[PDB]
Design a binder for this molecule. Structure first.
Ligand SMILES: [Cl-]
Ligand SMILES: [Cl-]
Ligand SMILES: [K+]
Ligand SMILES: [K+]
Ligand SMILES: [Mg+2]
Ligand SMILES: [Mg+2]
Ligand SMILES: [Mg+2]
Ligand SMILES: [Mg+2]
Ligand SMILES: [Mg+2]
Ligand SMILES: [Mg+2]
Ligand SMILES: [Mg+2]
Ligand SMILES: [Mg+2]
Ligand SMILES: [Mg+2]
Ligand SMILES: [Mg+2]
Ligand SMILES: [Mg+2]
Ligand SMILES: [Mg+2]
Ligand SMILES: [Mg+2]
Ligand SMILES: [Mg+2]
Ligand SMILES: [Mg+2]
Ligand SMILES: [Mg+2]
Ligand SMILES: [Mg+2]
Ligand SMILES: [Mg+2]
Ligand SMILES: [Mg+2]
Ligand SMILES: [Mg+2]
Ligand SMILES: [Mg+2]
Ligand SMILES: [Mg+2]
Ligand SMILES: [Mg+2]
Ligand SMILES: [Mg+2]
Ligand code: NA
Ligand code: NA
Ligand code: NA
Ligand code: NA
Ligand code: NA
Ligand code: NA
Ligand code: NA
Ligand code: NA
Ligand code: NA
Ligand code: NA
Ligand code: NA
Ligand code: NA
Ligand code: NA
Ligand code: NA
Ligand code: NA
Ligand code: NA
Ligand code: NA
Ligand code: NA
Ligand SMILES: [Sr+2]
Ligand SMILES: [Sr+2]
Ligand SMILES: [Sr+2]
Ligand SMILES: [Sr+2]
Ligand SMILES: [Sr+2]
Ligand SMILES: [Sr+2]
Ligand SMILES: [Sr+2]
Ligand SMILES: [Sr+2]
Ligand SMILES: [Sr+2]
Ligand SMILES: [Sr+2]
Ligand SMILES: [Sr+2]
Ligand SMILES: [Sr+2]
Ligand SMILES: [Sr+2]
Ligand SMILES: [Sr+2]
Ligand SMILES: [Sr+2]
Ligand SMILES: [Sr+2]
Ligand SMILES: [Sr+2]
Ligand SMILES: [Sr+2]
Ligand SMILES: [Sr+2]
Ligand SMILES: [Sr+2]
Ligand SMILES: [Sr+2]
Ligand SMILES: [Sr+2]
Ligand SMILES: [Sr+2]
Ligand SMILES: [Sr+2]
Ligand SMILES: [Sr+2]
Ligand SMILES: [Sr+2]
Ligand SMILES: [Sr+2]
Ligand SMILES: [Sr+2]
Ligand SMILES: [Sr+2]
Ligand SMILES: [Sr+2]
Ligand SMILES: [Sr+2]
Ligand SMILES: [Sr+2]
Ligand SMILES: [Sr+2]
Ligand SMILES: [Sr+2]
Ligand SMILES: [Sr+2]
Ligand SMILES: [Sr+2]
Ligand SMILES: [Sr+2]
Ligand SMILES: [Sr+2]
Lengths: 132, 337, 53
RNA sequence: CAACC
RNA sequence: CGAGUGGCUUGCUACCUCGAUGUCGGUUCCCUCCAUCCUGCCCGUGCAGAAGCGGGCAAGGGUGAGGUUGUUCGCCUAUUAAAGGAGGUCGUGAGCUGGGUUUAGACCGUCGUGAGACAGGUCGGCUGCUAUCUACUGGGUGUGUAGGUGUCUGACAAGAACGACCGUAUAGUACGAGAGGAACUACGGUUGGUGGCCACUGGUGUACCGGUUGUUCGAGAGAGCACGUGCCGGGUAGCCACGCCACACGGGGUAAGAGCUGAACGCAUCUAAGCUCGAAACCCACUUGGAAAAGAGACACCGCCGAGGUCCCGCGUACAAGACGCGGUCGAUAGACUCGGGGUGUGCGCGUCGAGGUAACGAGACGUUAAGCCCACGAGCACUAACAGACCAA
RNA sequence: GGUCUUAAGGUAGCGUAGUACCUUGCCGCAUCAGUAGCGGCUUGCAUGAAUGGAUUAACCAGAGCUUCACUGUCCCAACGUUGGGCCCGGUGAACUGUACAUUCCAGUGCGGAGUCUGGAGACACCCAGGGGGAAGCGAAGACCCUAUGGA
RNA sequence: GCGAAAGCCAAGGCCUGUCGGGAGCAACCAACGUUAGGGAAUUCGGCAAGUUAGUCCCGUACCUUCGGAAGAAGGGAUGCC
RNA sequence: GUGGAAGUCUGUUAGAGUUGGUGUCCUACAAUACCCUCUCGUGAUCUAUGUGUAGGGGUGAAAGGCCCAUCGAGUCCGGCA
């Protein structure tokens, strides 16, 4: 993928439960897999800010519940490092549901997003209210 | 089904024993290209700090922007090429033929060797030039040594001696180039060889850790879950199969870890100066203060503070040189805190 | 930059920026300040702080 | 599959 | 239908072991095989492209995470370049596990008149040992080569030290009616592996500073105990990874394959002689070890009445003993002291305030006070201690 | 089959069961995915009434399953604490020992060799280590069979 | 303090749960403390560890042999002067 | 409201016991030990001393358990070489 523009310490693994920062009707997402990732023996697959992941809906509306969808990680509690040396961290871990074309399934994003996630997913960004 | 997995640790840096010479010894040298010139230099590690640099990379989306970069401060005072050794090619490889020494010696070079009192530089030179006429001359190298005394933070006064190859134009020309340096007094500096922005390979003897177990030394797993409470926590599963009925040298075991020579490739020289611009408030921890000739190396360098590190023009650079990077800031914030 | 907590200048190439839930941003110069903030202490009530001084 | 069936 | 190869399954035999070679599965750690799943290079196609399908060379590297089940296998899920198979006493219990299997207790079904039986099911159910030799990982002392210091050589030896992927430009281009949709090359990044390092972030930090509960020292001050910190908050050095840095290109020879010249065979023919090319594979490049390489090495200087070395002393860039390294007055090597740089968070005492209370008394607040206390770091400084002195040596 | 053996021929209930071989039975629930678990169905290899059937509040260091919470069980390991370990004084055993023994790769051999054969490697001694091998030590195999053995 | 509970302290007893000396004291082992983010992914199985916790107030389901279930659950309070 | 029942609850009160760690130990401190966790603790309770039951016999809320480290028939000596 296109360089992210910052170094990331993945703060999530397969199985982690995160916030769905949108209005798709999904409230909580479970990480199932990480796009393009391949680990090593015994290593739990990890995902962090900027990765595209496959998720299952754990909490939300009946129609959304249990659906296996694609998403993009927009916030994480574990710090990331920007070119100027500063570390950046969020209040929670969150992702936004996305389609085949990486366009947000929802109409609105909830909460801030990392600028780096913009470079990658512009259409996701063109839905963000706050970009930090 | 027993999943695959690469083995633990590299088999390419063995045996993992205590280094024989604390002074690093390059086992390779740059190729002959430019004008004749000494292919290396040395200094003493002081510590680290960081600097803000203007992205120099012409292919980076950030070209021309502020960028914080880690730097290891190495004190690199002038050294003294004290002699010119000549190697001759033989059926059994390269062998020392003779050496051409000088008269002017640093006041304390006698703390390491028996300094010459009676030597014939012309007889030696004569034998060398005849070797060249015959076409039996191998490469040409300079016996070099440091001046620890010039570095206050380093307690040693005894000079560290190393042989550094001289490459360059034609042999005849670099032979003459070698002799010129030596004759003077051999005194040369970091500037004379490197330029800020070029890539250097740094060699040094890593920090010693004495005896350590397989987990730390080779990176094998610790025993997991229930297997961690029965009496075995940091011991590998087994030393090998029933057959072969012997333990292979490839199974990870305890032993000396650290204090090994390492040659780290493509280290970018961020800046070569002199003074106290890089020094840190309160002084570098366990080292002291810097106020003299110094070199800022991008990233990390093997070895503890005070150890002798060696520089050599990168023999396998991946990127082209982007000379004299613009340094907008050099942290002097205390390293204690 | 200045530390949004204690008031001292943040040494460049240092510190962490915490992004609040509502999108706000707090630039901390160190863990000490972050940790006091997590305890719910307000910088003005801590004598050692520039904000206080 | 680790004896008996 | 016919001919074989393997020794992964099963069967057969009863050769070895019953004065015992511990029994499935898993796990951990190491080496290997190729009948190749991916990656490299090719050939064919019912090959436009993209993509399939089949075949060849090839074992360098990779081949992962999860749900049921003790399971092997298998079924299933999301990822992936791919998530290949097999050997090593079905590698691996003087390594682990003990779910299964495999005693003694008990139940069910079936069988048995009964005692009792069942690779049928089910609940419970014990795992000893201070390593002699050998093997290897690291560390020393000697001898040999035959006075000392310093610097090297390189026979050999090890490496995967690098493997793979995504994205952008190429290009909505070549190709194709359209749909769809490449490549050479140049770039940015990710991942797995590898070595190292601590400026940054993060952990630790029973150094240290503070808060505070119970109790004891009459109160105060200052302390002990509450497990090797009572508990809680912060955290220096150091050590660390979750942090940071670095880890090619290019040559040479080939395989499959593409060809050239070319005859046997006037022609033809990539082959018989000769030659041009051509794989992640082989060799070199690069890193690491390496004078005990018995052809036991090379060079320079010093010394043979003295070069150098040992003991001794102060110490760590070193360290389980040993080893290693630095300094020893021609000195800043360690400590003290003073600064600097750091940690904590505002000391004791006193003064004002303080809900009240006749008063006594009074939790606590402000000031004095960026205070007090403390520091495994740095500088300065010969104040103390590196003194005195003994010995070997061609 | 629409009686026959041998008296009767399974009623109420329960049912893929701690009983179902087939079997991961079929449907549903739950999970991204559930040979598990629960509900239903059920022709029950081979359930069933004091050989007690069914059912059941309370109880339980009894067996199985799910959820919330939490966490170094795990990703993936780090630093620290105390006692050992290491060095020194003193004290001072045992196990085990046919012999020889510096081994490695192959082969051979009663087919599972440090000792045979061919090669390779190998200067002696010592310290620490984790245990690959000595089909390691410990116990005349408890399994299996055999004995005109025992209980 | 509810307490013959814990913890601390008297009276009384002891330094004999009887080998010491030394190395910032390495690997490794026994006990144990602290671990960012994720939170059972580990495993036959949450085994081990942890979480909760005392007292008062509010409030408390299915089911039930009407006893119980029940401290269900869930919520709030807690010092000193 | 009183009352204070219960093979009733909590409880390392004393005392009794022992689910798990398959922890420590396994030439042991110990021929059955140590630590944490755990169960019972007004009763078919626990416990001291005395006393009775004897080997094809006892005793057994039944495990072939126990009858002096010995039990699907104790120990000793004899039969017996
Ligand atoms: Cl995955
Ligand atoms: Cl393990
Ligand atoms: K049997
Ligand atoms: K046998
Ligand atoms: Mg695994
Ligand atoms: Mg620091
Ligand atoms: Mg800082
Ligand atoms: Mg036989
Ligand atoms: Mg054995
Ligand atoms: Mg092949
Ligand atoms: Mg291989
Ligand atoms: Mg096996
Ligand atoms: Mg074994
Ligand atoms: Mg065993
Ligand atoms: Mg053992
Ligand atoms: Mg079981
Ligand atoms: Mg069982
Ligand atoms: Mg059986
Ligand atoms: Mg069922
Ligand atoms: Mg009846
Ligand atoms: Mg026998
Ligand atoms: Mg038998
Ligand atoms: Mg009989
Ligand atoms: Mg943690
Ligand atoms: Mg698993
Ligand atoms: Mg438990
Ligand atoms: Mg009695
Ligand atoms: Mg019985
Ligand atoms: Na053990
Ligand atoms: Na074995
Ligand atoms: Na065959
Ligand atoms: Na096994
Ligand atoms: Na391969
Ligand atoms: Na499975
Ligand atoms: Na075996
Ligand atoms: Na075992
Ligand atoms: Na096993
Ligand atoms: Na080639
Ligand atoms: Na019946
Ligand atoms: Na009970
Ligand atoms: Na832990
Ligand atoms: Na062994
Ligand atoms: Na004594
Ligand atoms: Na009444
Ligand atoms: Na117990
Ligand atoms: Na009898
Ligand atoms: Sr295996
Ligand atoms: Sr050298
Ligand atoms: Sr070399
Ligand atoms: Sr065990
Ligand atoms: Sr063998
Ligand atoms: Sr035997
Ligand atoms: Sr082949
Ligand atoms: Sr391929
Ligand atoms: Sr199966
Ligand atoms: Sr098998
Ligand atoms: Sr079992
Ligand atoms: Sr079975
Ligand atoms: Sr049975
Ligand atoms: Sr000899
Ligand atoms: Sr493209
Ligand atoms: Sr199109
Ligand atoms: Sr204490
Ligand atoms: Sr507490
Ligand atoms: Sr060819
Ligand atoms: Sr020699
Ligand atoms: Sr019926
Ligand atoms: Sr019943
Ligand atoms: Sr032989
Ligand atoms: Sr040992
Ligand atoms: Sr007393
Ligand atoms: Sr005594
Ligand atoms: Sr702490
Ligand atoms: Sr689980
Ligand atoms: Sr699981
Ligand atoms: Sr509560
Ligand atoms: Sr009771
Ligand atoms: Sr009780
Ligand atoms: Sr047990
Ligand atoms: Sr425990
Ligand atoms: Sr025992
Ligand atoms: Sr009572
Ligand atoms: Sr007995
Ligand atoms: Sr007799």
């Amino acid at each position: 993928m296109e360089a992210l523009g910052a170094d990331v310490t993945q703060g999530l693994e397969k199985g982690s439960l995160i916030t769905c920062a949108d209005n798709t009707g999904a409230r909580e997402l479970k990480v199932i897999s990480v796009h393009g990732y391949s680990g090593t023996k015994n290593r739990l697959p990890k995902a962090g800010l900027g990765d595209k992941i496959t998720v299952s809906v754990t909490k939300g509306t009946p129609e959304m519940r249990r659906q296996v969808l694609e998403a993009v990680v927009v916030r994480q509690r574990k710090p990331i490092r920007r070119p100027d040396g500063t570390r950046v961290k969020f209040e929670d871990n969150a992702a936004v549901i996305v389609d085949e074309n990486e366009d947000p399934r929802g109409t609105e994003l909830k909460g801030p997003i990392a600028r780096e996630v913009a470079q990658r997913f512009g259409s996701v960004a063109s839905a963000a209210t706050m970009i930090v | 089904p027993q999943p695959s997995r690469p083995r633990k640790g590299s088999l390419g840096f063995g045996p993992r024993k205590r280094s024989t010479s604390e002074t690093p010894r390059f086992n390779s040298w740059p190729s002959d290209d430019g004008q004749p010139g000494v292919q290396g230099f040395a200094g003493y590690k002081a510590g680290m700090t960081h600097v803000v640099l203007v992205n120099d990379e012409p292919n980076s989306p950030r070209e021309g922007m502020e960028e914080t970069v880690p730097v290891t401060v190495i004190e690199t005072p002038p050294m003294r090429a004290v002699a010119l050794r000549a190697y001759e090619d033989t059926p059994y490889g390269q062998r020392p033929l003779t050496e051409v020494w000088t008269d002017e010696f640093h006041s304390e070079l006698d703390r390491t060797l028996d300094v010459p009192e009676d030597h014939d530089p012309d007889a030696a030179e004569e034998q060398i030039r005849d070797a060249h006429e015959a076409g039996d001359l191998g490469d040409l190298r300079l016996i070099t040594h440091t001046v620890p005394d010039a570095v206050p933070s380093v307690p040693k006064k005894k000079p560290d001696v190393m042989e550094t190859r001289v490459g360059g134009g034609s042999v005849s020309d670099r032979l003459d180039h070698a002799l010129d340096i030596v004759e003077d007094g051999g005194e040369h500096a970091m500037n004379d060889i490197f330029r800020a922005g070029e890539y250097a390979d740094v060699a040094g003897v890593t920090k010693g850790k004495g005896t350590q177990g397989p987990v730390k030394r080779w990176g094998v797993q610790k025993r997991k879950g229930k297997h961690a409470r029965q009496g075995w926590r940091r011991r590998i599963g087994n030393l090998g199969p029933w057959n072969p009925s012997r333990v292979r040298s490839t199974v990870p075991q305890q032993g000396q870890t650290g204090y090994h020579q390492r040659t780290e490739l493509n280290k970018r020289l961020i800046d070569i100066g002199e003074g106290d611009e890089p020094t840190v408030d309160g002084g570098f921890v366990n080292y002291g203060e810097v106020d003299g000739p110094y070199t800022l190396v991008k990233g990390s360098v093997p070895g503890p503070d005070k150890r002798l590190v060696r520089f050599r023009p990168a023999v396998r650079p991946n990127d082209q040189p982007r000379l004299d990077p613009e340094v907008r800031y050099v942290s002097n914030e205390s390293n204690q805190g | 930059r200045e530390c949004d907590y204690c008031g001292t200048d943040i040494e460049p190439g240092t510190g962490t920026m915490f992004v609040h839930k509502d999108g706000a941003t707090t630039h901390f110069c160190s863990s000490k300040c972050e940790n006091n903030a997590d305890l719910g202490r307000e910088a003005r009530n801590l004598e050692w702080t520039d904000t206080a001084r």
